[PDB]
Design a protein around this nucleic acid. Structure first.
Lengths: 61, 106, 85, 247, 43, 72
RNA sequence: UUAUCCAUUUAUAGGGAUGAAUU
RNA sequence: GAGAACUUUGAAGACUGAAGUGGAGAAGGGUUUCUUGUCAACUGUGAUUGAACAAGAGUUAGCCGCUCCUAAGGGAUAGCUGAAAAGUGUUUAAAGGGGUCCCCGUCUCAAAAGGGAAACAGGUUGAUAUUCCUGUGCCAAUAGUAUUAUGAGUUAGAUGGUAACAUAUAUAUAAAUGAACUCCUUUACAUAGGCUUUACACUCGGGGUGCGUUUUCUUUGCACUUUACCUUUAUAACAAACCUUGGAAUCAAUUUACUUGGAGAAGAGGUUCGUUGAACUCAAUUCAAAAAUUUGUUUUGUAGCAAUAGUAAUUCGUAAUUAUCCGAAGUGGUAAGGACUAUCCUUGAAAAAAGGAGGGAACGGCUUUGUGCUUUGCUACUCUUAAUACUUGUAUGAGCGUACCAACAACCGCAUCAGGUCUCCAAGGUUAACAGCCUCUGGUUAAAUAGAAAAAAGUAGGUAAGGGAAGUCGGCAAAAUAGAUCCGUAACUUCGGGAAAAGGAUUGGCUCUGAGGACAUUAAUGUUAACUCAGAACUGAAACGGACAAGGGGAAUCCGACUGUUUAAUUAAAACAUAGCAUUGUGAAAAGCCACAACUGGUAUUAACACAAUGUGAUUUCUGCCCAGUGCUUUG
RNA sequence: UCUGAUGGAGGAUCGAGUUGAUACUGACGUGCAAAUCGUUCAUUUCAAUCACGUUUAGGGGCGAAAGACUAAUCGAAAAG
């Protein structure tokens, strides 16, 4: 199973013939949205804190 | 994996029988009954939680020290500070209005 | 985008029950789930809690109102006659 | 035959009211000298839901006068009452929404709820959600007052009987179509074992005068006389008329 | 069950005590016997 | 079990009439670290010692009425 | 209105001009 | 052993497969438990076995439960009915407690899953363990007097903070006066959804130790590497709430979601609770700058419990010595908590018990006038925790349960019966998955029998050329794909659906390519993590959801709108229910409907937007004529 | 008015478990069984399911109604 996991890490057993659950069951779209949103919000907070963006510009973005 | 079993005669997961697995120094995984979480004491008027007071179940509250059952002010333990402030102003101002209503009479 | 042409909030009922029944329940669930104007605080934040009880999320103060709207026209007119005197 | 479903109701075994979570009987204040000769104000502290009924109930706190302390009363809330309001009850209470007054002290044309059909029975008429009675006449001699009840009947009540000014809240409830049998189930789960019904015409003759036959019909006139015995009063009881109304 | 009342436990003990055979010395000068699986106490 | 840190309070607890025993534990760490634990009616009080010298004067300086229990 | 019957209560003040409040 | 297919041991081949013949319980059983015997019968074959028979033994609690509280409710009291038997249970009741006159008040039972004083680990037996032993704790109780001692307070009740609020660390944060009378809080509560934190679980890599493989390969595969309650555990961190300052439109802060603000936002500084429970230099400690005690740098300690225990090893008389028990992470399985949002013609117990407050009744000590009150000379004086001594009747910890089964032969089915029977724990691989299939720990290799042969016939299945429903009452039965991704999807329609319509394509392995984050430095360069998608080459007997798992679709008619329910053991439906619709009675304790022998009761903790009695049966569109008959009903 | 996300409603869908019982009119029908076994099938957020407690008792109860059920007994239980 460790060898199989190394191969999967190289991306070796995940073709569309190896998938049994739906796209969302395999990778929740809600979780993907949440991760992206947290990433972008964190970046905006960093910029506004470091004063690289005005407060209004931060709010608009 | 080590599997556990109830130890406290209640073999149903009622709200008073929630459990928590711990690892013992003997290397085995046992189960401990957790105490029910107690609600916060609440203000007599606004019903919000009173701060400065612990939130213990009655048995634990009876054993708690007097310091963290009360708040050293006026009502302080039954009325929140905002409600107390409003009550002070209301008590003083309404008697003042009663007196001015008296003095206006003649 | 626009998710339903006309069914609105009644889309939760699918195809069940008649279209007239769904339309009638829409016309009053619209006002049951609305936010009304709290005259005590001036913020439009009073929502229905139970069938006749309406609570403002800001003042925390609650009033007795209609089953589906904060006020009912019958009681509105009734109060107005009293206030006239 | 056997005892029919209507007859089994009075035994009160499984047909007692489901009243486990009821908050208390809705009665207004017992008559006091303060109410009789002046006014007494109590403040409404909460507006709560009584599971059996649709009308909200106001918890009105009065200050006791025969001794130091407070007394809590469960009133049927009229529409417009709010927590923190001061309600005034008595002969000299002003005419405003929420106040309890003798019906002889109100001008003709006002709308009232919580009507005492006899003075002092602390509230017996006009209590379902959205209802209201109208004071339509006052006797010249006083001591009598004529009101229109929500059924439309005109009733004469002595002018010392009390009522709330206003309309009992939660009005318009009937307007919502109960969409489904489940909503009906939940509605009656907190009132009574009166639901589902089952038609007598779908029964067997042993258990209902409508039961039996090869075609599911009544077979005899469904208008039964007022004198019919308990197992017989099953159709349209003492119907003066029948069929769609025309006015 | 493991949970018992005092009287019930004493009755169980009495039944166990009576389920014993006739003493050998007596027999040289019993029908009312039961097995836990065949005939139940019902008491 | 309680842990006491200053020497003054530990000595005071030792001098109490209630205390019954002192437990001396010594063990290697990497230097021998020790700990002295007074057995009173309510609690067992412990003090740890990195300092061999302090630890070696204190148990002696303690008065010998109460009984020694050496675990190592 | 005294028999009889009903209602309410803690049988708790004789008739007319959203603070507490008890010793 | 007289005797062994079914007793025991070792070896092998397999099974159960954490949804278990695995561990714990309840109901029920009642000694079936354990040890030693042991075989007349039973253990549907054998039997040396056994849940059989025989003799002995075995169940240890202040902390686990009952016991207490109250619930649905039961019994009883007062009455009142009744020949009584019985029925009802405040309906003319003078119906224990509190303080010191007044105030409160039917009794009792009903939960081994609700509420609830307090326990953990290690070890131990043939059989019991949160019960025994060892160690460490915790809860409740603890009378009067007197001595001490611990602390506060006082020349009659302390003090800090602007505030949120904080403060008693004595062995032990015990004491911060407080009556009547009050007012609150806790106990104390639904469902759905996601987000989040923590513990446990699982997993990855490093180090050590042991074992295994070793024709060949393999810095390798496996195992251990642990840490309880308690210490208001101290702190640290965080979701919230609140306080101070502040003063917001170019509105801003902010969540996955929306949430919030001149009724005071952002920013800055704080307070508290709740989560957790050694986090954080946490504690003590080494070294330097602040001054008549703070800020940085180090040592120690698994923070105490605690290593003394446990585990895995190496040895030595045969009971002891020894060494290890520590470095970094990932997935999201379970549980709990948090802050939220949403839903209801549904709003989701009570009491015992505990706490907080408002109020301000009473008031030092020695002695003395006179009649508890003014009085005289003097001041070191009250509460709180602990111990001791004496008096108090003997001045700690009641009683009961505790073995075993829980079905697989301990229960109920007449039985050692393929049936039935409530709860908790819950590993790895593949996978959407607690599915199926295989596996580790644990368990098993047992089933009212075995051996041989192996035809008919039966039963439970497979496969069949060509045809493809010609069979048959009828496609009964079987077959046909069936996962996922991409594409495509009609009539009709209540505009929501129909829909997985229909119908196409692809799918393995291998080698790569691209995309999606976190962490620091003086616009610039390094360290490091998930599996998730997309694309391309190559490769093969063109095969790839390879096993497992897994819709047949379409055109129409009838019926019932739908979800739902039903003739337990021949009918599951078109029957019943239903929402919707309509009609009828009733304004009340001299009412409607209904119960009762009476008394009294149910609806009713009710009041026409209600209750009761019927019919029809979603929606859409309609619901015609007849009051002669029979009913019902209205006036005189 | 339109498009993309977000969101997570519904007596929504599939589906194990649970709860049942459509068909084979399969097996069995001197059964394992006085209702079982196999495959197939219905059902799983709600009028859902389960436990214990509790209430309703025989010309009575209880019935989403089949004269169903009321201890293998029901168009009037069982015992004497």
């Amino acid at each position: 199973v460790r060898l199989y996991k190394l191969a999967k890490r190289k991306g070796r057993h995940m073709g569309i013939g190896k998938r049994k659950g739906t796209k969302n069951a395999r990778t929740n779209q809600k979780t993907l949205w949440i991760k992206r949103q947290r990433v972008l919000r964190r970046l905006l907070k960093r910029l506004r804190d470091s004063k690289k963006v005005d407060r209004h510009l931060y709010h608009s973005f | 994996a080590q599997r556990v079993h109830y130890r406290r005669h209640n073999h149903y997961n009622t709200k008073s029988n929630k459990v928590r697995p711990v690892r013992t120094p003997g290397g085995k995984l046992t189960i401990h009954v957790v105490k029910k979480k107690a609600g916060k004491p609440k203000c007599a008027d606004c019903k919000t939680a009173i701060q400065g007071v612990k939130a213990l179940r009655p048995a634990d509250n009876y054993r708690a020290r007097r310091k963290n059952r009360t708040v050293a002010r006026a009502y302080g333990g039954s009325i929140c500070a905002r409600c107390i402030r409003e009550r002070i102003m209301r008590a003083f101002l309404f008697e003042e209005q009663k007196c001015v209503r008296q003095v206006l009479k003649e | 985008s626009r998710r339903t042409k006309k069914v609105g909030l009644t889309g939760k009922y699918g195809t069940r029950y008649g279209s007239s029944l769904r339309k009638q329940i829409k016309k009053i669930e619209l006002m049951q789930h609305a936010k009304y104007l709290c005259t005590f605080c001036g913020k439009t934040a009073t929502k229905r809690t139970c069938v006749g009880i309406w609570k403002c999320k800001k003042c925390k103060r609650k009033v007795c109102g209609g089953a589906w709207s904060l006020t009912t026209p019958a009681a509105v007119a009734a109060k107005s006659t009293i206030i006239r005197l | 035959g056997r005892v029919i479903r209507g007859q089994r109701k009075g035994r009160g075994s499984i047909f007692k009211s489901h009243n486990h979570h009821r908050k208390g009987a809705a009665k207004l204040r017992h008559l006091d000298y303060c109410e009789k000769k002046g006014y007494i104000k109590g403040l409404v502290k909460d507006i709560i839901h009584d599971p059996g009924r649709g009308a909200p109930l106001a918890k009105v706190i009065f200050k006791r006068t025969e001794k130091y302390g407070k007394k809590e009363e469960l009133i049927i809330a009229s529409e417009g009452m709010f927590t923190g309001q001061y309600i005034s009850c008595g002969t000299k209470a002003p005419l405003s929404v929420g106040n309890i007054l003798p019906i002889g002290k109100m001008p003709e044309g006002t709308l009232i709820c919580n009507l005492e059909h006899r003075t002092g029975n602390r509230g017996t008429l006009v209590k379902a959600s959205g209802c209201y009675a109208t004071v339509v006449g006052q006797s010249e001699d006083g001591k009598k007052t004529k009101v229109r009840l929500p059924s439309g009947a005109k009733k004469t009540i002595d002018a010392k009987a009390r009522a709330m000014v206003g309309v009992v809240g939660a009005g318009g409830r009937i307007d919502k179509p109960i969409l489904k049998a489940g909503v009906a189930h939940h509605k009656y789960r907190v009132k009574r074992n009166c639901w589902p019904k089952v038609r007598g015409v779908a029964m067997n003759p042993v258990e209902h005068p409508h039961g039996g036959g090869n075609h599911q019909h009544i077979g005899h006139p469904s208008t039964v006389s007022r004198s019919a015995p308990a197992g017989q009063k099953v159709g349209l009881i003492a119907a003066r008329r029948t069929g769609l109304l025309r006015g | 069950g493991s949970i018992k009342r005092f009287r019930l436990k004493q009755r169980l003990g009495k039944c166990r005590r009576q389920n014993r055979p006739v003493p050998h010395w007596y027999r040289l000068k019993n029908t009312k016997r039961r097995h836990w699986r065949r005939t139940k106490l019902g008491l | 079990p309680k842990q006491i840190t200053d020497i003054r309070k530990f000595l005071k607890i030792s001098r109490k009439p209630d205390t019954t025993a002192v437990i001396i534990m010594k063990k290697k760490s990497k230097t021998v670290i020790t700990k002295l634990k007074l057995r009173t009616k309510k609690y067992l009080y412990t003090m740890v010692f990195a300092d061999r010298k302090k630890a070696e004067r204190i148990e002696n300086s303690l008065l010998p009425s109460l009984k020694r229990i050496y675990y190592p």
